[PDB]
Structure formats: structure tokens, C-alpha cells
Coordinates of C-alpha atoms (C1' of nucleotides) in Angstrom, one line a residue:
Chain A
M1 CA 152.3 111.4 69.5
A2 CA 152.1 110.5 66.0
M3 CA 148.3 110.1 65.6
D4 CA 146.1 113.1 65.2
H5 CA 142.8 111.7 66.2
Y6 CA 140.9 114.0 68.6
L7 CA 137.1 113.7 68.5
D8 CA 135.3 116.1 70.9
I9 CA 131.8 115.5 72.1
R10 CA 129.5 117.0 74.9
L11 CA 126.8 115.6 77.3
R12 CA 122.8 115.6 77.2
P13 CA 120.4 115.6 80.1
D14 CA 118.2 113.0 80.9
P15 CA 116.0 112.3 84.2
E16 CA 115.9 108.6 84.1
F17 CA 119.5 108.2 85.0
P18 CA 122.2 109.3 87.2
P19 CA 125.8 109.5 86.4
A20 CA 126.3 105.8 87.3
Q21 CA 123.0 105.0 85.5
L22 CA 124.6 105.9 82.3
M23 CA 128.2 104.8 83.5
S24 CA 127.2 101.4 83.8
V25 CA 125.5 101.3 80.3
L26 CA 128.9 102.9 79.1
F27 CA 130.7 100.2 80.6
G28 CA 128.5 97.8 78.7
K29 CA 128.5 99.2 75.3
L30 CA 132.2 100.2 75.2
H31 CA 133.9 97.2 76.4
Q32 CA 132.2 94.6 73.9
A33 CA 132.7 97.0 71.0
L34 CA 136.2 97.4 71.9
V35 CA 136.4 93.7 72.3
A36 CA 134.1 91.8 70.0
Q37 CA 134.3 94.8 67.4
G38 CA 137.9 95.8 68.8
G39 CA 140.5 97.6 67.1
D40 CA 144.0 98.4 68.4
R41 CA 143.9 101.7 66.4
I42 CA 141.1 102.8 68.7
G43 CA 140.8 103.8 72.3
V44 CA 140.0 106.4 74.7
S45 CA 141.8 108.8 77.2
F46 CA 141.3 110.5 80.8
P47 CA 142.8 113.9 80.5
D48 CA 139.9 116.0 82.3
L49 CA 139.7 114.6 85.9
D50 CA 140.6 115.3 89.4
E51 CA 141.6 113.6 92.7
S52 CA 139.1 115.0 95.3
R53 CA 136.5 116.4 92.8
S54 CA 135.9 113.0 91.4
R55 CA 135.7 114.0 87.9
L56 CA 135.1 110.8 85.8
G57 CA 133.3 112.1 82.6
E58 CA 133.2 115.6 81.6
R59 CA 133.5 115.7 77.8
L60 CA 134.5 113.6 74.5
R61 CA 138.0 112.5 74.6
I62 CA 138.7 109.9 72.1
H63 CA 142.0 108.4 70.2
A64 CA 141.4 107.3 66.9
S65 CA 142.6 107.6 63.0
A66 CA 141.5 108.0 59.3
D67 CA 140.3 104.4 59.2
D68 CA 140.6 102.7 62.5
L69 CA 138.6 105.2 64.7
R70 CA 136.9 106.3 61.2
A71 CA 133.9 104.4 62.1
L72 CA 133.1 106.5 65.2
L73 CA 131.0 108.8 63.1
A74 CA 128.7 106.4 61.2
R75 CA 128.2 103.6 63.9
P76 CA 124.6 102.3 65.0
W77 CA 126.3 100.5 67.8
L78 CA 125.9 103.4 70.0
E79 CA 122.5 104.1 69.5
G80 CA 120.0 104.8 72.3
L81 CA 121.9 107.6 74.2
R82 CA 120.1 110.2 72.0
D83 CA 118.2 111.3 75.2
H84 CA 121.4 111.5 77.2
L85 CA 124.6 112.1 74.9
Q86 CA 126.3 112.6 71.5
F87 CA 129.5 112.4 69.9
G88 CA 132.1 114.0 67.6
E89 CA 134.6 113.5 64.8
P90 CA 138.4 113.9 64.7
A91 CA 140.3 116.9 63.9
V92 CA 143.9 118.1 62.7
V93 CA 146.0 117.8 65.8
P94 CA 149.0 120.2 65.8
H95 CA 152.7 119.5 66.3
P96 CA 153.3 120.1 70.1
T97 CA 150.8 118.0 71.9
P98 CA 150.5 116.8 75.4
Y99 CA 149.9 112.8 76.8
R100 CA 148.2 112.3 80.3
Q101 CA 148.8 109.1 82.4
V102 CA 145.8 107.0 83.0
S103 CA 145.1 103.2 83.7
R104 CA 142.1 100.9 83.4
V105 CA 143.4 98.4 85.9
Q106 CA 141.9 96.3 88.5
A107 CA 142.8 97.2 92.1
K108 CA 142.2 94.8 94.7
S109 CA 141.4 95.3 98.4
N110 CA 140.7 91.8 99.9
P111 CA 141.7 91.5 103.7
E112 CA 140.2 88.0 103.5
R113 CA 141.8 87.3 100.1
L114 CA 144.5 85.3 101.9
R115 CA 141.9 83.2 103.6
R116 CA 140.0 82.5 100.1
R117 CA 143.2 81.7 98.8
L118 CA 144.3 79.4 101.4
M119 CA 141.0 77.7 101.3
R120 CA 142.4 76.3 98.1
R121 CA 146.0 76.4 98.7
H122 CA 146.7 76.3 102.3
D123 CA 143.8 75.1 104.4
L124 CA 144.3 77.9 106.6
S125 CA 140.7 78.7 107.8
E126 CA 139.2 81.8 109.4
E127 CA 139.9 80.6 113.0
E128 CA 143.5 80.9 112.9
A129 CA 143.9 83.0 109.9
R130 CA 144.5 86.0 111.8
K131 CA 148.2 85.4 112.5
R132 CA 150.1 87.0 109.7
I133 CA 147.5 87.4 106.7
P134 CA 147.1 90.8 105.3
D135 CA 144.7 92.8 107.7
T136 CA 144.9 96.2 106.1
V137 CA 147.1 95.9 103.2
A138 CA 144.2 95.3 100.6
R139 CA 143.4 99.1 100.7
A140 CA 140.6 100.6 98.7
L141 CA 141.1 102.6 95.4
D142 CA 138.3 105.5 95.8
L143 CA 137.6 107.4 92.6
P144 CA 134.6 108.4 90.8
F145 CA 133.0 105.9 88.3
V146 CA 129.9 104.2 87.5
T147 CA 128.0 101.6 89.5
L148 CA 128.0 98.4 87.8
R149 CA 125.9 95.8 89.3
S150 CA 126.9 92.2 88.8
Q151 CA 125.3 89.3 89.9
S152 CA 126.6 89.8 93.4
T153 CA 124.0 92.5 94.1
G154 CA 122.2 95.5 92.7
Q155 CA 124.2 98.0 94.6
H156 CA 126.6 100.6 92.8
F157 CA 130.0 99.1 93.3
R158 CA 132.9 101.9 92.8
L159 CA 135.3 102.1 89.8
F160 CA 138.8 102.0 91.0
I161 CA 141.3 103.6 88.9
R162 CA 144.8 105.1 89.1
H163 CA 145.6 108.4 87.2
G164 CA 149.1 109.3 86.2
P165 CA 151.8 112.0 85.4
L166 CA 152.1 114.3 82.4
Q167 CA 155.4 113.9 80.0
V168 CA 156.2 116.0 77.1
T169 CA 157.2 113.0 75.0
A170 CA 154.8 110.4 73.9
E171 CA 154.4 106.6 72.8
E172 CA 152.6 105.7 69.8
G173 CA 151.2 102.1 69.7
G174 CA 148.9 99.9 71.6
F175 CA 147.3 100.1 75.2
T176 CA 144.9 97.9 77.0
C177 CA 141.4 96.9 75.9
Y178 CA 140.0 99.7 78.2
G179 CA 142.1 102.4 76.8
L180 CA 144.1 102.8 80.2
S181 CA 148.0 103.0 79.8
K182 CA 149.2 99.3 80.3
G183 CA 152.7 100.4 78.8
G184 CA 151.7 103.2 76.3
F185 CA 151.4 107.1 77.3
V186 CA 147.6 107.7 77.0
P187 CA 146.2 110.9 75.3
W188 CA 145.2 114.0 77.3
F189 CA 144.4 117.0 75.0
Chain B
rC1 C1' 133.6 141.4 176.0
rU2 C1' 126.9 138.8 173.8
rA3 C1' 121.0 138.2 181.2
rA4 C1' 128.5 136.8 179.3
rG5 C1' 131.3 132.5 181.6
rA6 C1' 129.8 126.2 183.8
rA7 C1' 126.9 121.2 183.6
rA8 C1' 125.4 113.0 182.8
rU9 C1' 118.4 112.3 183.9
rU10 C1' 119.0 107.7 185.1
rC11 C1' 116.2 102.8 185.1
rA12 C1' 111.6 98.7 184.5
rC13 C1' 107.1 96.9 182.0
rG14 C1' 101.2 91.4 178.7
rG15 C1' 95.9 95.7 176.4
rC16 C1' 92.8 92.2 176.4
rG17 C1' 88.3 89.7 174.6
rG18 C1' 83.3 89.2 170.8
rG19 C1' 80.5 90.2 166.3
rC20 C1' 75.4 88.7 159.1
rU21 C1' 75.5 95.4 156.0
rU22 C1' 71.5 94.6 153.4
rG23 C1' 67.9 95.0 149.4
rA24 C1' 66.4 97.7 143.6
rU25 C1' 67.2 99.6 138.9
rG26 C1' 66.5 100.7 130.3
rU27 C1' 72.1 105.2 128.6
rC28 C1' 69.9 106.5 124.4
rC29 C1' 70.3 109.4 119.8
rG30 C1' 73.3 111.1 114.4
rC31 C1' 77.3 111.3 111.3
rG32 C1' 81.3 111.5 103.5
rU33 C1' 88.5 112.2 105.8
rC34 C1' 90.0 114.4 101.3
rU35 C1' 94.1 114.5 97.8
rA36 C1' 99.6 113.7 96.1
rC37 C1' 104.0 111.3 94.4
rC38 C1' 110.8 108.1 90.6
rU39 C1' 115.1 104.1 97.1
rG40 C1' 119.9 100.9 90.8
rG41 C1' 121.2 104.2 100.4
rU42 C1' 127.1 101.5 98.3
rU43 C1' 120.7 95.5 102.1
rC44 C1' 130.1 96.3 103.0
rA45 C1' 134.0 102.6 99.9
rC46 C1' 134.3 96.8 96.9
rU47 C1' 132.7 90.6 97.0
rG48 C1' 134.5 86.4 95.1
rC49 C1' 138.3 85.4 90.7
rC50 C1' 146.2 82.9 88.4
rG51 C1' 151.5 83.9 94.2
rU52 C1' 149.7 83.8 101.7
rG53 C1' 154.3 88.7 98.6
rU54 C1' 151.4 95.6 96.6
rA55 C1' 151.6 93.4 88.7
rG56 C1' 146.0 90.8 86.4
rG57 C1' 141.8 88.2 81.8
rC58 C1' 136.1 88.5 85.2
rA59 C1' 128.7 88.3 86.5
rG60 C1' 131.1 94.7 86.1

RNA sequence: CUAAGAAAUUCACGGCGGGCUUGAUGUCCGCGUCUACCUGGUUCACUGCCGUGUAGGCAG
């Protein structure tokens, strides 16, 4: 926990979008700025969620610095949510701070994924494909997120994600492109 | 302690033949239904993605 980039921000109310109706736009306007724009000294955390309540977004919680995340207060790439949101700037963090566990990982729940794999790897079709394939091992990761409707359909798909524990020690460096800890202790202030 | 107490009705069969219901007719007349709006139900709690084995870049 060497960085001291805590930038808090709040929400804004709008009538033309639900939580997914701006969460899919957040997934569209954060990943490309973290990919085509990029920056390993910039990301996000998830320190204010819950399991049963399904709290996905409740406040500004980012991880930046004096130069890498210093363009998070003069950025016209996030312009348009002035009817539904806002942002802040980084503040001086203290010595003893926490570090929450998160992950922006991909969970898979295919019970017929063995059949779609064997269609190009085994030739075992759907007729005899119920002998030893995983019928219920492909579980679902139920959690609250936005409903990103890709070309498969217009319905709101669930945003699977795994939380983590809380350790007093920290780990500075780099995480995945989504900000979830792929080896690095994520921030939770 | 009951008008108490008891009991075998048996057997058989030809209803049958006939027939003109007819003819007539005006249902007329009238009408303002009127205003109002946000499905991305998740047209599967996830399709389809490197290992059929629990870690992942994707149209998110």
C-alpha cells in the first residue's frame, strides 16, 4: 500500500436508465479507456459490496497517482454522464490503510461446453454426450452487475465476479485490465 | 318381555289391421363512447470462445 490515490465520487439520478442501463455504458466507457488509453498506474477497486445485497456500485473508489491517474480530473472521455454521475480527485492517504480482495475474472457455467468442445475435439455429439460430461459442474456465479447485451441478444446478462478476503499487508504494482486482483492486493478504503 | 313367539305362491301366453291437415299475410322508427400513458421480463441466473479436468484474451 505505497500509493495514496483515493478519489471519491457520488452518483446522480436520471430517469432514462436503470442500474444496468448505466452499468453497461460504464463497461463500454471504462474498458477501452483502460485498454486503448490504458495505464498500469491506474485502475479501480471494490471495497463497498455485499454478497446477498448485491451492492455493485455505491461510491467513487479508484486507484491512481500523481501522474498516471492524474488525468482523472481533466478527462473529456467520460463526458455524458452529467445527467447520471460525477467524479472526484485524489487525496492524501494515511500510513495504515486496508486492501480488499476482488477479481474481474470470467466465470464459466457451460454444462454443454464439453459437447461444443468435443464437436471440434472429440466428435462426441449430443446423442451419446450424457455419459461422463459435466452436467452440473458448470455452476453460475450469481452477483450484481450490469446487463451488457452483446450480439447474442438484447437481454441483460449477469455480471459474474468473485470477491476476496481482507489482509493488513499490501502489494503495490499491476493488476488486470479490469482492475480486479489477478495477483495484486486490490484497494478497499 | 313389544296383538310377543312361526311360515316357499307357484306355473303358461301373437293385439291386430287402415288412413291427404289445409289455406293467408309490410315490423317499422332515432341516436357523438370519451380521455390517458417509458417492457433493454434475464424472448435461459449466462450463450458461444485455448484442456472433455474447477485457472482465461472475447459481440459484453
